[model samples]
Target chain A: PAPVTVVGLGPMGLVLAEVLLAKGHPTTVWNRTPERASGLVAQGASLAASITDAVSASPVTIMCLNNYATMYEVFGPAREALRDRVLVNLNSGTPQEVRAAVSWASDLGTRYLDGAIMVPPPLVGRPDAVFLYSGDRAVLDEHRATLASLGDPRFLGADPTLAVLYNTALLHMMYATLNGYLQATALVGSAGVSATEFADIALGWFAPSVLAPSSLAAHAVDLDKGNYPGTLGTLRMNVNALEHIARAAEEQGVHSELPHLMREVAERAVAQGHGDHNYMSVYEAFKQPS
Target chain B: PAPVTVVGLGPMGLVLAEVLLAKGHPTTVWNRTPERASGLVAQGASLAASITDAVSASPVTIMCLNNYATMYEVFGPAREALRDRVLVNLNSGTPQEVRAAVSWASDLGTRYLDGAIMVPPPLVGRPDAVFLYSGDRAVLDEHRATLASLGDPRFLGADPTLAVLYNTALLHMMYATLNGYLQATALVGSAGVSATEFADIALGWFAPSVLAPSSLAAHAVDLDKGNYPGTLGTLRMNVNALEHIARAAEEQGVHSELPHLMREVAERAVAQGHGDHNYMSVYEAFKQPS
Candidate 1:
């Protein structure tokens, strides 16, 4: 079996170590706070006394930390031990930081793969979850089977920053969807609709059919040209529509911030010569600082 | 069969007429530009020669038009013909407009049910499509069956404004979802993920499961004392995560407006003592005036 070491045993890190042990890999686990590694150590995995010991135990080391700052705090001291090894940094960080980490790993004679796990801790080892990696194809190829023990491993080509790219992009989508839902629920709740009932109907029925597909189609148009023609719905119509929502929210005595922001974006898009286009033209609002 | 008349033959208006005709209602249709009503008239529906004829032909008149301005332009002059009838206005307008129209209808001796169609025109008559109505309960109850032929009727109580309120609130949700997808697609496309494929996987799967529920949960928190505990995810975590996306978009040569906006919102939420809350606290960003 290939030797695998996991560093930074946060919830995600512990999950990573657990999967490696379950798959029968020779797994070594380490965390700055030693107590954090106890659960993994009990799962038949060896515990490393130091960062150097962890890196030296395996040719492939998976580092999952809270951020690039924390990752640097722990692994910055073990540069020598990482020599000629593959370092898969699954920690979240800016693209510039990922690029910087790649340079640092290179300087230490280590192969690097920037990775982002796309699911929560519980889904880490499941085939249904996705683990995205970029940089050092040969390094990724060598450990593909071992990584598969964690989840479906997606190799994203040679740019070391791509994994973080996927991570951040998905995060944007998640936050926006979440914020919008909050506004909708508040609006409906003001009208006496229960949050749980609205959620059941909105999430199960409305989102799958209308919201998701329309958004995807709009995204495609935005990617091609910052313009989206309202084949489905127009920006002008949306602006008028948003005004109605904001007005209603005010009457209901709830904050109309979300609708007001939407109207502002649409209005800006219109002023910038996209009034006749689709709502996807909202990208213009984001392009220049308001 | 109860007599039903549809005034205005826009995309939504035509759909309303087709649905009423399909359901075997005695349907009369008329439009300012007569050619607009050709398709409906060909489907065994009577075409009134004038607005007066249309209003006088049916005891229940359903009007789906451009705006309250246009609604008045077409029907205000034909008020004498509408006495003793029930008028259901599905036109897109402000709550104030709906309330005003209800008063106008009452002055003309007409029972008024202000309504807003919740589904797109094509979805008309589907078992799952919803149509929201507000205003006089007795008016809605009297014509409930006739409206049922158009879609599943959702009675939103006596507020006369709730119908348009629901319509606009849903519209806000749609725009926010579209903007979120646009940002995500731009971020990933920078890393070689095809827009279509990303849409199919990210929007199809993750959005429905993760994004929608989280947003609704956040709204619940926003409403009750503004404490956004991440039942699923947290604020500082999202702030750290979105920074990666915004930076990645810049690296990939794509526009970063969407993610930048999210980062800005996260920053505000954090500064306002919501650092530990869920990302839904983005309502703070929207609350401020430009």
Candidate 2:
């Protein structure tokens, strides 16, 4: 039974180390700021005095830092000690950064598994929290049991960048949805309606019927051929409706950019000879630089 | 046991008439094109040959035409027959138009209730559907039972434009959500992720958790002082993230207007000293011209 080592004692890294410890695995821990590992050290785990000692203490070492820059900054000095070990990085970074990290690890003769944490730190080790990994499948297979202790380990194939891709894409969805909510709250607040009441109606009732179905149908078109049928509403209808929103916002003395942007995209799609198609034809607008 | 007349045999009107008839109310219906009333006539509803007969047959008349212009075109000639009647306009229109329609109805010695349907025709008669009404609480009270059969009736006080205001504001939320879904689908599609799979994760999972709660929180601020807390993520963080989305869209050869618009609003909010606030400071951006 090879031991497991966890580096970077940030909140997320500490949680990950706790999961391994709870599973009765022999865990070694390290942090650039060594003072952050006191809690882990108390949890029946060994705290390495240095990064090299941490790597040498276990065959598989996990890294969960803020970003690639911080990861390299802390571990760059200890690269020589990581040879012949498995380095699994769960840090958040860009796709290119993930690829570069893979190359950096390989140069040190280390087996690399680029992974991403899909849940917040509190949900670590829970069945619902997903931890996605991508890299050499054989290396992941060797430590499957230990990794599963962290959460539901989702294997994303051999592409080192796949985990980060998922993280970035999911975050994009999150921010977009959050912005929409803010815009909506402003619009309805003008009428003195309570946000709680509106949310009950919007989330529990309206989102399931209107927003979700349309999104799924639109995705079907984007993935299939970029050809959308105007089953629910035409592109012209959306353009006209969005125009109304912009005009209404202006009349109410509010910024009309939200609707104006939507109308502009629909208008562009119409100009491209897709006016007769569904409003989802605006997907083309997303793929182009305005 | 006052008689009720429903003008316009569109799907929604027919559903409203059906609910009245099912409740054993004496219902009269009239359609501009007359033939649209055949199904309602078979369902125990009295079909009026002309708009004049429809107005005269009942003291309470409900109009569910396509828009304000069409509503006028259909009922303008029969204004004389509507004297002393209660006119409830459930048609879609702007707040200004709704107010104008109230004045128009009041001029003919008619009590008026302006309403907006919050559900599709299929859900019209169900308790789940919501019908928002404004203007003359007395008029709404007189026919509350009959109106309740159509859906969950919500009285929005004395402002004749309240119903339409609610409708337009809710639509803004809906459209913003749909656009977010479109952007998300595009990003995941780029990673070879299937739309169905993404929908399962987004609609089934994320919508309930992140999207709904954030929207509700945004709505709360809108209802209060429109002051957003920066507990989750600040407007500056969102603006920075939106820039990444714009750049990503451009790299993928997509139109970046939607994300760009979000960034523009965030930038303006930040410039106006709202960088530390939550993204709901976008309300300030909407209130001014770009």
Name the best candidate (by DockQ).
Answer: 1
Score residue B151 of candidate 1 by CA lDDT: 76
Candidate maximizing lDDT? 1
Q: What overall lDDT goes with each candidate model?
A: 0.76, 0.75
Q: CA shift at A48, candidate 2, in angstroms?
A: 4.4
Give the C-alpha interface root-mean-square deviation per candidate: 4.5, 3.8
lDDT of 1 by residue, A42-100 (tens): 87899998899999999899999877777667887788999988888988766778888
Q: Tell me how far the alpha carbon of residue A290 in candidate 2 is from the true structure, in angstroms, after superposition.
A: 4.4
lDDT of 1 by residue, B196-271 (tens): 7677767666666666544555455345555566654567666777777776667666666556666776787788
Model 2 chain A is weakest, by summed lDDT over 10 consecutive residues, at A213-222
Instruction: Enumerate residue pairs that collide in model 1.
Output: A178-B215
User: Where's the lowest-lDDT run of ten residues in candidate 2 chain B?
Assistant: B214-223
TM-scores, all candidates, are 0.74, 0.71
How would you class the docking of model 2?
A: acceptable
* Residue B212 shift from truth in candidate 1, angstroms: 8.4
